[PDB]
């Protein structure tokens, strides 16, 4: 086994890991691919998402050529710290983890020609600026940008290993998404100009579509049932002032409870979302059903109900039994067609 | 190989414990910041989180090299072998340098000896916010940059590029705040251990009112309006007018309770508190108005309709007048 020990000692003899390969001679070309083991949950409140990847980088270092019984050295990852590696970082990363349980989750393989393969297991939290105007029927393109921290494009360039569409692969059953659907991803590469120079940036946009099922169950269905309940009052006799006032005030309190609690998981945006409009309109219908009874009660003459002369069924009530359900159905037709 | 020999000679005999010009004039350090994002502006924790690219420039003559017309961008581990300023943030609470895939740090040398040293830092800096006009308040959050152990006789800070030393503020988009301006201040701070150079980066934040209109102001306005409906109901409908009056009082409590749970326990009255108290008084007085009407007819009868007709004007007029004084004072 001392043959392979002597090969490693020769490689590291007089080797400077402070210098990128080809420094002052050529541009270091780094080929990258990403295997997404899990696309983690998306946090709307923080406008961030989590992704777990195998981040693979490959480049050629002529100082690491060797001859031996094997053509590839599948080495302990501690060998990585003794050689030069790319200083890749994620531009939109917030707080990432390079896993090291039970050992640093890194592999290093050296081919005899001097090509290096260097992969690591990462958990990246990345910024995804969301536009929530169409929430909860919104779609987002969450980016994942990475590149060199220190080396400009005249020094280090990044490329995708295979075709860009094939250089980012997501595992078949690795979705940790709860309320989003990963429709697909687009792979690109660009250039960023900063105060320190011009840098290659490799981008991947993950296209996410929110699932509406949770908000139908917990927001849209309760709102609709509160509107339907508020219109049950129209079918009670006008001499039921306490009963029809309870209908009006409880549904208004219910809509207020729904309204202030529907944005609890969202960032406090200044603009109004699609769900805000639906709740505001449902509030108007519920508010108008209590104003309607006030008008009916104002034209009630006698304080006794039908068992002398008796009150008549209100014309306002007769038309409200039709107009209110009809206009709420029309709103739902326009609302859902506008956003779906 | 020439570069490798050059770097070894630079680091051979180099003393990291000594600053450049250790026994001479102070080393001038130029700083610029590229702000990547501001987030988590919290009134509960009284702090904001800032991600930035923190660049420091200084000339260390021990690192001057000749023969190479290149700027030597070295591996970031060489920073541990060089002298770097002991710069720190005074109001920083929790701060880390990003370390994926490697430590987000850069060292770039120049032939004359100039060192460019960059770090990607996320820091949570304390920002004590005065919330007396909340949610119509303007906050001023600062970042205080200081040398820890070197006084003004050993080190000097300046903003490299003047007023253009900080970039990226125009690209920041806060969901709840708008940045009005940012300033760069250079000054000295004296402690018991000496005078120290300080650089200040302050932002002025204006809170967006749109969220609070839908969340607290509009439900309070509509509930206050709804309590006037009792003025149009007959005096003898005690069950209906008490149910309406008490429900509007209960509704105002729910609005305040939800708002209270999202805020730090501050000892003074905020602007939004003043509005909910105003709306509560109007809702409370409408309920007390019926009790006055009920007492006059039943406890004193042995004009009832005048009081209700009078209230149909005064309550809408006084509440609109209250909104006039409130919004003129705070907007």
């Amino acid at each position, epitope marked *: 086994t001392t043959v392979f020990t002597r090969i490693l000692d020769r490689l590291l003899d007089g080797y400077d890991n402070r210098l990128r390969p080809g420094l002052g001679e050529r541009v270091t070309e780094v080929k990258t691919d990403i295997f997404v083991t899990s696309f983690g949950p998306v946090s709307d409140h923080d406008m961030e998402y989590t992704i777990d990847v195998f981040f693979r980088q490959s480049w050629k270092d002529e100082r690491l050529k060797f001859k031996g019984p094997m053509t590839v050295l599948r080495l302990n990852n501690l060998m990585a710290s003794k050689i030069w590696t790319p200083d890749t970082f994620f531009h939109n990363g917030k707080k990432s983890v390079a896993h090291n349980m039970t050992m640093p989750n890194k592999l290093l393989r050296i081919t005899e020609d001097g090509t290096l393969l260097y992969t690591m297991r990462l958990t990246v939290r990345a910024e995804c600026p969301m536009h929530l105007e169409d929430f909860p029927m919104d779609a987002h393109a969450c980016p994942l940008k990475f590149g060199s921290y220190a080396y400009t494009r005249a020094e280090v360039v990044y490329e995708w290993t295979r075709e860009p569409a094939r250089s980012v692969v997501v595992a078949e059953d690795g979705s940790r998404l709860n309320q989003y659907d990963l429709l697909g991803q687009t792979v690109d590469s660009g*250039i*960023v100009q900063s105060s320190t120079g011009e840098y290659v940036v490799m981008t991947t946009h993950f296209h996410l579509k929110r699932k509406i099922g949770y908000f139908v169950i917990q927001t849209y269905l309760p709102c609709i049932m509160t509107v339907i309940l508020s219109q049950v009052s129209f079918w009670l006799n006008r001499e039921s002032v306490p009963a029809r006032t309870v209908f009006g005030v409880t549904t208004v309190l219910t809509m207020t409870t729904l309204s202030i609690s529907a944005r609890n998981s969202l960032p406090k945006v200044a603009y109004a979302t699609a769900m805000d409009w639906f709740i505001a309109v449902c509030y108007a219908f519920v508010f108008s059903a209590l104003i309607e009874f006030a008008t009916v009660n104002y034209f009630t003459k006698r304080g006794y109900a039908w068992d002398k002369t008796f009150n008549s069924v209100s014309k306002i009530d007769r038309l409200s039994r039709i107009a209110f359900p009809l206009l709420f159905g029309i709103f739902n037709l326009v609302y859902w067609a506008t956003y779906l | 190989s020439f570069v490798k020999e050059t770097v070894d000679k630079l680091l051979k005999g180099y003393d990291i414990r000594l600053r450049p010009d250790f026994g001479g004039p102070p080393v001038c350090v130029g700083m610029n910041i590229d702000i990547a994002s501001i987030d988590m502006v919290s009134e509960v924790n009284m702090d904001y989180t800032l991600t930035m690219y923190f660049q420091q420039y200084w000339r260390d003559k021990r690192l001057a090299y000749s023969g190479i017309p290149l700027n030597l961008t070295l591996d970031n581990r060489v920073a541990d072998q060089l002298w770097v300023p002991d710069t720190y943030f005074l109001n920083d609470k929790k701060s880390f340098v990003h370390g994926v895939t490697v430590k987000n740090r850069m060292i770039r040398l120049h032939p004359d000896g100039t060192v460019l040293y960059g770090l990607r830092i996320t820091t949570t800096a304390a920002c004590m916010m005065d919330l007396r006009r909340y949610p119509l308040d303007e906050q001023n959050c600062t970042l205080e940059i200081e040398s820890y152990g070197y006084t003004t006789d050993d080190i000097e800070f300046y903003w490299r590029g003047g007023d253009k030393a900080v970039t990226g503020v125009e690209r920041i988009e806060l969901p709840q705040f708008s940045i009005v301006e940012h300033r760069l201040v250079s000054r000295n701070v004296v402690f018991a251990t000496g005078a120290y150079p300080r650089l200040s980066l302050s932002f002025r934040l204006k809170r967006n009112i749109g969220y609070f209109i839908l969340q607290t102001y509009m439900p309070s306005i509509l509930i206050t309006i709804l309590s006037w409906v009792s003025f149009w109901i007959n005096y003898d409908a005690s069950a209906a007018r008490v149910a309406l009056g008490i429900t509007t009082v209960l509704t105002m409590t729910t609005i305040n309770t939800h708002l209270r749970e999202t805020l730090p326990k501050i000892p003074y009255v905020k602007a939004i508190d003043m509005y909910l108290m105003g709306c509560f008084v109007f809702v409370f007085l409408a309920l007390l108005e019926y009790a006055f009407v009920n007492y006059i007819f039943f406890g004193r009868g042995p004009d009832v309709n005048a009081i209700d007709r009078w209230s149909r004007i005064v309550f809408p007029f006084t509440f609109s007048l209250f909104n006039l004084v409130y919004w003129l004072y705070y907007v």
Partner: nanobody
Amino acid sequence: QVQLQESGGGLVQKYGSLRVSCAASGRTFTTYIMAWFRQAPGKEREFLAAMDQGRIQYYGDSVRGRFTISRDYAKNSVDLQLDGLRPEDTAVYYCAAGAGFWGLRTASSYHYWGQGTQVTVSS
């Protein structure tokens, strides 16, 4: 209402330098991707350049290294510098802004479009 107004253009001599600027109003596009497209006569819209909130520049292959895209986030504007102009570059240049859903190079991802500036190169 949201409006995007291109400026510059007209006629330019071969090899001339032209700067095309776009002014946006009615909505702040700080978090959006502001792009440039061109449409040769009898041809589909061709992606030229884009620049997102992080100042990352994307380019089409035919214009990479020739055209430069910059943004004035304070002025809510995007500019496209045209250099090495050739008669093949004569088209209608469009300013666009969008969230880049299903790709920032596809024209269907941009919701806001300018009217269009005619750029012509005479040889």
